[PDB]
Design a protein around this motif. Structure first.
Motif, PDB file in Angstrom:
ATOM      1  N   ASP A   1      58.711  57.729   4.700  1.00  0.00           N
ATOM      2  CA  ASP A   1      59.315  56.807   5.671  1.00  0.00           C
ATOM      3  C   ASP A   1      58.245  55.813   6.040  1.00  0.00           C
ATOM      4  N   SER A   2      57.074  56.368   6.282  1.00  0.00           N
ATOM      5  CA  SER A   2      55.950  55.566   6.631  1.00  0.00           C
ATOM      6  C   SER A   2      55.595  54.734   5.406  1.00  0.00           C
ATOM      7  N   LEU A   3      55.622  55.307   4.208  1.00  0.00           N
ATOM      8  CA  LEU A   3      55.259  54.537   3.011  1.00  0.00           C
ATOM      9  C   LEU A   3      56.030  53.206   2.801  1.00  0.00           C
ATOM     10  N   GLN A   4      57.301  53.153   3.213  1.00  0.00           N
ATOM     11  CA  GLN A   4      58.174  51.978   3.022  1.00  0.00           C
ATOM     12  C   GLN A   4      57.949  50.663   3.773  1.00  0.00           C
ATOM     13  N   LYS A   5      57.103  50.632   4.789  1.00  0.00           N
ATOM     14  CA  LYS A   5      56.925  49.364   5.469  1.00  0.00           C
ATOM     15  C   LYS A   5      55.760  48.588   4.834  1.00  0.00           C
ATOM     16  N   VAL A   6      55.207  49.087   3.720  1.00  0.00           N
ATOM     17  CA  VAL A   6      54.090  48.377   3.076  1.00  0.00           C
ATOM     18  C   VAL A   6      54.497  46.995   2.747  1.00  0.00           C
ATOM     19  N   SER A   7      53.514  46.121   2.684  1.00  0.00           N
ATOM     20  CA  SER A   7      53.766  44.758   2.296  1.00  0.00           C
ATOM     21  C   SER A   7      52.430  44.101   2.000  1.00  0.00           C
ATOM     22  N   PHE A   8      52.413  43.229   1.013  1.00  0.00           N
ATOM     23  CA  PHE A   8      51.164  42.586   0.682  1.00  0.00           C
ATOM     24  C   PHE A   8      50.635  41.790   1.865  1.00  0.00           C
ATOM     25  N   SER A   9      51.545  41.227   2.651  1.00  0.00           N
ATOM     26  CA  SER A   9      51.181  40.401   3.796  1.00  0.00           C
ATOM     27  C   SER A   9      50.355  41.198   4.807  1.00  0.00           C
ATOM     28  N   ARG A  10      50.898  42.358   5.183  1.00  0.00           N
ATOM     29  CA  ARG A  10      50.200  43.261   6.030  1.00  0.00           C
ATOM     30  C   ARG A  10      48.813  43.401   5.399  1.00  0.00           C
ATOM     31  N   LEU A  11      48.771  43.854   4.139  1.00  0.00           N
ATOM     32  CA  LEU A  11      47.479  44.031   3.436  1.00  0.00           C
ATOM     33  C   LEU A  11      46.456  42.936   3.694  1.00  0.00           C
ATOM     34  N   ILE A  12      46.924  41.697   3.764  1.00  0.00           N
ATOM     35  CA  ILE A  12      46.046  40.564   4.006  1.00  0.00           C
ATOM     36  C   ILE A  12      45.521  40.637   5.432  1.00  0.00           C
ATOM     37  N   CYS A  13      46.427  40.914   6.364  1.00  0.00           N
ATOM     38  CA  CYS A  13      46.081  41.005   7.780  1.00  0.00           C
ATOM     39  C   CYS A  13      44.993  42.027   8.115  1.00  0.00           C
ATOM     40  N   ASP A  14      45.072  43.253   7.538  1.00  0.00           N
ATOM     41  CA  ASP A  14      44.089  44.301   7.811  1.00  0.00           C
ATOM     42  C   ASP A  14      42.749  44.081   7.069  1.00  0.00           C
ATOM     43  N   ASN A  15      42.718  43.208   6.066  1.00  0.00           N
ATOM     44  CA  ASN A  15      41.505  43.089   5.238  1.00  0.00           C
ATOM     45  C   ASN A  15      40.900  41.708   5.076  1.00  0.00           C
ATOM     46  N   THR A  16      41.307  40.783   5.930  1.00  0.00           N
ATOM     47  CA  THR A  16      40.755  39.438   5.891  1.00  0.00           C
ATOM     48  C   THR A  16      40.809  38.872   7.291  1.00  0.00           C
ATOM     49  N   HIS A  17      40.237  37.677   7.458  1.00  0.00           N
ATOM     50  CA  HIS A  17      40.298  37.026   8.771  1.00  0.00           C
ATOM     51  C   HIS A  17      41.347  35.934   8.771  1.00  0.00           C
ATOM     52  N   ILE A  18      42.477  36.222   8.130  1.00  0.00           N
ATOM     53  CA  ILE A  18      43.603  35.307   8.097  1.00  0.00           C
ATOM     54  C   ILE A  18      44.502  35.938   9.140  1.00  0.00           C
ATOM     55  N   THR A  19      45.153  35.115   9.951  1.00  0.00           N
ATOM     56  CA  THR A  19      46.006  35.632  11.009  1.00  0.00           C
ATOM     57  C   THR A  19      47.454  35.203  10.864  1.00  0.00           C
ATOM     58  N   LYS A  20      47.700  34.295   9.925  1.00  0.00           N
ATOM     59  CA  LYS A  20      49.049  33.808   9.675  1.00  0.00           C
ATOM     60  C   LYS A  20      49.397  33.987   8.202  1.00  0.00           C
ATOM     61  N   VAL A  21      50.437  34.772   7.947  1.00  0.00           N
ATOM     62  CA  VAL A  21      50.868  35.043   6.586  1.00  0.00           C
ATOM     63  C   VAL A  21      52.377  34.939   6.472  1.00  0.00           C
ATOM     64  N   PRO A  22      52.891  34.759   5.246  1.00  0.00           N
ATOM     65  CA  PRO A  22      54.337  34.663   5.047  1.00  0.00           C
ATOM     66  C   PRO A  22      54.871  36.091   5.022  1.00  0.00           C
TER      67      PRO A  22
END
Ligand code: HEM
Ligand SMILES: *[C@@H]1O[C@H](CO)[C@@H](O[C@@H]2O[C@H](CO)[C@@H](O[C@H]3O[C@H](CO)[C@@H](O)[C@H](O)[C@@H]3O)[C@H](O)[C@H]2NC(C)=O)[C@H](O)[C@H]1NC(C)=O
Ligand SMILES: *[C@@H]1O[C@H](CO)[C@@H](O[C@@H]2O[C@H](CO)[C@@H](O[C@H]3O[C@H](CO)[C@@H](O)[C@H](O)[C@@H]3O)[C@H](O)[C@H]2NC(C)=O)[C@H](O)[C@H]1NC(C)=O
Ligand SMILES: *[C@@H]1O[C@H](CO)[C@@H](O[C@@H]2O[C@H](CO)[C@@H](O)[C@H](O)[C@H]2NC(C)=O)[C@H](O)[C@H]1NC(C)=O
Ligand SMILES: *[C@@H]1O[C@H](CO)[C@@H](O[C@H]2O[C@H](CO)[C@@H](O)[C@H](O)[C@H]2NC(C)=O)[C@H](O)[C@H]1NC(C)=O
Ligand SMILES: [Ca+2]
Length: 595
Positions: free
Chosen positions: A542-563
Motif C-alpha cells: 500500500d505504501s509502495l504505490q505512492k512512489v513517483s519520480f517527482s517525489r524522488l526529486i524532492c527528497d534528493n535535490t534542492h528543487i522545490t517545484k516539480v510536475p
C-alpha cells in the motif's frame, strides 16, 4: 525449467532458499533452475541465429556471400541514406519530457549488456583494427561508402569489435555463437548495486554500519553526495578535457558516465539508497549493516519496477499494453525470465528519441548562465560539467522541462549520435551509433525483419508495394528496397523502428510485440516481483504505490517545484506544484518490533 548445459561464467554460488533478498548475480531466483536470469549467461534465443556460415560469421563478413541472394548494404550507407537528417526544427515530442527518453536508458542498462570482446590491453590489433581497417577475428570494421564525407576527414573505416560470447574470449566454440549478458535479467536495480560480488562490494561503505553506499570525498553538491570517481587511469572522462581532469563515476553499471544525463540519474538513485538507509536506521536502531543495505536495496528495486510498469510502459506501448502485459496473476516459475538477444535491439528505439541539445535551467527554470544549451556530443563522458559547473539540479530541471525527440520517419537519429559519438576506447568524436547498431545486429546473428513479423503474427511484405502499406510511407519504402532488394533482408533494428507508432504509444506493432513479450516475462518470471505475495507486506505494498519520480526529486535535490506527471510534457509554471504537495513515502510499515 532450464538453467545450463555448457556454462562456465561466475563460480560457486550456493543458495539459501529462505533468504528474503535477491542475490547480486541473479542466481537462485528460480529454485528449479538457479541460473535462469543470472548475469554472465547467454542471452536467450527466441529464434535460431542466422549467420553467414551458420555458426559465427556475420552477414557481410565474406564479400561474395549473399543473404537470400543479395549483398547486404554497408551499415554506414544505411545510416547515411535513411537514418540521417539535418534540420532539428520541429523534431521534439510535444507530449513526452526529456525524462521519458532517460528512464528508457535506465531500465535498459538494468536489463542487458553485451560487452565487447576485450582480449587484452596488451593487444596491438586494437590499432590494427583502428589504423588499417583489416577485417579479421574480432575486428569487423564499419567501412565508409564512397562519397561519405568521413572518408576525406577520418579515414577508411570506423573501429568495431564483435561482442563477447559464452564459452571463451579468445577462439571459438562448437554449436552456434551466443552473446553474453553481463547483467541480471530481472528489473532489480543492478545498475545501482552491480551484477558482481567483486563490484557490489567495492561500491558499499563497509566502514560505517549504516548500510550506505560509498560516496565521493573530493566533491559535494550543496551538501549532497556524488558517485565516487573511478580507478582505471586511462580515464575517458579525463580525456575530453585534460585541463579539468575530472574522472568518470563508479557505479553498479560500467556505462553510467556515457552521457551527463545518465550519470545524473545514477546519482539520484545513489542518493535515494543512502537516504532510505538513514531513515531505516531511525525506525530500527537495532538493524545491522547488512540488513540496512539489503532492505533499502529491496526498496529501490521495487521503486524501479513501479515507475517502469505503472508510468513508463503504458506510454511506450500505447493501446498494445494490455494485449501483451495482462494484469499480474502471480509468480509463475514456468516462465523464462531471460532477456532475449533480439530485445537488446528492439529496446534501442530509444536512440531515435535523443534530441541534439541538453539544457541547464536555474531556480526559476530560466537559462542557467550564458552557455545553458549545449550540443549533446560535448556531453559524452563529461563528468566535469557536473562537478565544476552547477551540480545536478540544473540538469534535473532540464529533464523535467525539456522534451524528448519524437521518432519521425524522415528524421530518425540526430547527428550528435550519428556522426559525433565518442567511444571510450578511441579518441575522436566521430562515431555513428546508427551504423554501429546495424553492425551489431549482424554481429549478433539476428533473423531479418520478416522472421520477426512472422514471429509476431504480423503480415510479411514481400514487395515494394507491400512494404509501403506496412510502413505507410512510399519514399522510405523505396530507399529500403533499393538498399536491401528484399524485405527479408531488412535488419530488425531499422525495420522495427521504421514502422508508424501504435495509438498512444511511441513504437510500432513489431516493436510493441517484442518489447511487450519480454517485459511480461521478466515480471511473471521474477520470484521477487514487488507484488508477489510474501515479498512485501500488504502494508508495505500500500505504501509502495505512492512512489513517483517527482517525489524522488524532492527528497534528493534542492528543487522545490516539480510536475506531478514527470513523463508527459510539462510547462513551467502551470504544471509545477510545490514539493510539499507531493505524496511522500510512508516508511512506517518497515518498523520491526521484537514482540
Ligand atoms: C550516448 C547514448 C545515449 C544517449 C545520449 C543512448 C540512449 C539510449 C536510450 C534513450 C535507450 C532506450 C530507451 C537506449 C537503449 C539502448 N542503448 Fe544506448 N545510448 C547511447 C550510447 C549507446 C552505445 C554506444 C551503445 C552500444 C552500441 C553497441 O552495440 O556497441 C548503446 C546500447 C544500448 C542498448 C544495448 C545494450 C546491450 O544490451 O549491450 C539499449 C537497449 N547505447 N540507449
Ligand atoms: C499526454 O500524455 C497523457 C498520458 O500519456 C495523456 O493523458 C492520459 O489519458 C489517459 C486516458 O487516455 C488517462 O489515464 C487513466 O485514466 C484514469 C483516470 O481516472 C485512471 O484511473 C486509469 O488507470 C487510466 O490509466 C490519464 O488521465 C492521462 N495520463 C496522464 C499521465 O496524465 C494526455 O492526453 C497527453 N496529452 C495530449 C494533449 O495528448
Ligand atoms: C575544460 O574545463 C575547464 C574547467 O576546469 C573549463 O574552464 C572553465 O569554464 C569557464 C571557461 O570558459 C570558466 O567560467 C567562468 O568563470 C567565471 C564565472 O563564474 C568567469 O570569471 C570566467 O570568465 C569564466 O568564463 C571557468 O572558471 C573555467 N575554469 C577554469 C579553471 O578555467 C574549460 O572551458 C574546459 N574546456 C573544454 C575544452 O571543455
Ligand atoms: C561512510 O559512511 C560514513 C558515515 O556513516 C562517512 O563518514 C562521515 O563523513 C562525513 C563527511 O566526510 C562527516 O560528517 C564525518 O566525517 C563522518 N561522520 C561519521 C559519523 O563518521 C564516510 O565518509 C563514508 N565513507 C565513504 C567513502 O562513503
Ligand atoms: C505460466 O507460464 C506458462 C508458460 O508460458 C503458461 O503455460 C501455458 O501456455 C504455454 C505456452 O506458452 C503452454 O505450456 C500451455 O498451453 C500452458 N501451460 C500450462 C501450465 O497450462 C502457464 O499458463 C502459466 N501458468 C499459469 C498457471 O498461469
Ligand atoms: Ca537487472
Amino acid at each position: 525449467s532450464w538453467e545450463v548445459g555448457c556454462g562456465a561464467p561466475v563460480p560457486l554460488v550456493k543458495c539459501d532458499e529462505n533468504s528474503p533478498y535477491r542475490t547480486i548475480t541473479g542466481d537462485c531466483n528460480n529454485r528449479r533452475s538457479p541460473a535462469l536470469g543470472a548475469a554472465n549467461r547467454a542471452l536467450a534465443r527466441w529464434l535460431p541465429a542466422e549467420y553467414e556460415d551458420g555458426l559465427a560469421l556475420p552477414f557481410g563478413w565474406t564479400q561474395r556471400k549473399t543473404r537470400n541472394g543479395f549483398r547486404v548494404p554497408l551499415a554506414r550507407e544505411v545510416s547515411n541514406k535513411i537514418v540521417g537528417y539535418l534540420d532539428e526544427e520541429g523534431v521534439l515530442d510535444q507530449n513526452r519530457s526529456l525524462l521519458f527518453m532517460q528512464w528508457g536508458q535506465i531500465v535498459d542498462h538494468d536489463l542487458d549488456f553485451a560487452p565487447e570482446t576485450e582480449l587484452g590491453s596488451n593487444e596491438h590489433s586494437k590499432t590494427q583494427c583502428e589504423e588499417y581497417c583489416i577485417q579479421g577475428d574480432n575486428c569487423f570494421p564499419i567501412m565508409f561508402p564512397k562519397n561519405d564525407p568521413k572518408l576525406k576527414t577520418q579515414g577508411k573505416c570506423m573501429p568495431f569489435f564483435r561482442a563477447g560470447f559464452v564459452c571463451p574470449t579468445p577462439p571459438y566454440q562448437s554449436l552456434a555463437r551466443e552473446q553474453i549478458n553481463a547483467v541480471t535479467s530481472f528489473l532489480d536495480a543492478s545498475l545501482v548495486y552491480g551484477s558482481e560480488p567483486s563490484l557490489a562490494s567495492r561500491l558499499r561503505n563497509l566502514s560505517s554500519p549504516l548500510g550506505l553506499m560509498a560516496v565521493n570525498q573530493e566533491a559535494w553538491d550543496h551538501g549532497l553526495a556524488y558517485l565516487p570517481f573511478n580507478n582505471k587511469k586511462p580515464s575517458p572522462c579525463e580525456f575530453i578535457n585534460t585541463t579539468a581532469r575530472v574522472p568518470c563515476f563508479l557505479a553498479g553499471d560500467f556505462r553510467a558516465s556515457e552521457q551527463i544525463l545518465l550519470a545524473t540519474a545514477h546519482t539520484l538513485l545513489l542518493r535515494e539508497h543512502n537516504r532510505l538507509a538513514r531513515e531505516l536506521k531511525k525506525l530500527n536502531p537495532h538493524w545491522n549493516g547488512e540488513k540496512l543495505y539489503q532492505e533499502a536495496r529491496k526498496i529501490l528495486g521495487a521503486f524501479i519496477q513501479i515507475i517502469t510498469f505503472r508510468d513508463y510502459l503504458p506510454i511506450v506501448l500505447g493501446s498494445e499494453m494490455q494485449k501483451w502485459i495482462p494484469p499480474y496473476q502471480g509468480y509463475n516459475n514456468s516462465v523464462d525470465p531471460r532477456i532475449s538477444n533480439v530485445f537488446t535491439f528492439a529496446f534501442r528505439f530509444g536512440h531515435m528519441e535523443v534530441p541534439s541539445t541538453v539544457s541547464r535551467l536555474d531556480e526559476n527554470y530560466q537559462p542557467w548562465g550564458p552557455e545553458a544549451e549545449l550540443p549533446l556530443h560535448t556531453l559524452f563522458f563529461n563528468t566535469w560539467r557536473i562537478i565544476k559547473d552547477g551540480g545536478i539540479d540544473p540538469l534535473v530541471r532540464g529533464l523535467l522541462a525539456k522534451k524528448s525527440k519524437l521518432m519521425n520517419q524522415d528524421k530518425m537519429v540526430t547527428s550528435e549520435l550519428r556522426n559525433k559519438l565518442f567511444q571510450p576506447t578511441h579518441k575522436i568524436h566521430g562515431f555513428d551509433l546508427a551504423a554501429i547498431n546495424l553492425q551489431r545486429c549482424r554481429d549478433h546473428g539476428m533473423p531479418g525483419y520478416n522472421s520477426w513479423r512472422g514471429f509476431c503474427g504480423l503480415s510479411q511484405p514481400k514487395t515494394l508495394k507491400g512494404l509501403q502499406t506496412v510502413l505507410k510511407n512510399k519514399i522510405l519504402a523505396k530507399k529500403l528496397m533499393d538498399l536491401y532488394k528484399t524485405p527479408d533482408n531488412i535488419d530488425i533494428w531499422i525495420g522495427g523502428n521504421a514502422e508508424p507508432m501504435v495509438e498512444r504509444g511511441r513504437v510500432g506493432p513489431l516493436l510493441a510485440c517484442l518489447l511487450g513479450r519480454q517485459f511480461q516475462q521478466i515480471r511473471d518470471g521474477d520470484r521477487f516481483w514487488w507484488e508477489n505475495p510474501g515479498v512485501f507486506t500488504e502494508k508495505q505494498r500500500d505504501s509502495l504505490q505512492k512512489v513517483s519520480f517527482s517525489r524522488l526529486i524532492c527528497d534528493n535535490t534542492h528543487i522545490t517545484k516539480v510536475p506531478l506527471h514527470a513523463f508527459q510534457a510539462n510547462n513551467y509554471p502551470h504544471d509545477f506544484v510545490d514539493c510539499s504537495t507531493v505524496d511522500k513515502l510512508d516508511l512506517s510499515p518497515w518498523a520491526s518490533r521484537e514482540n
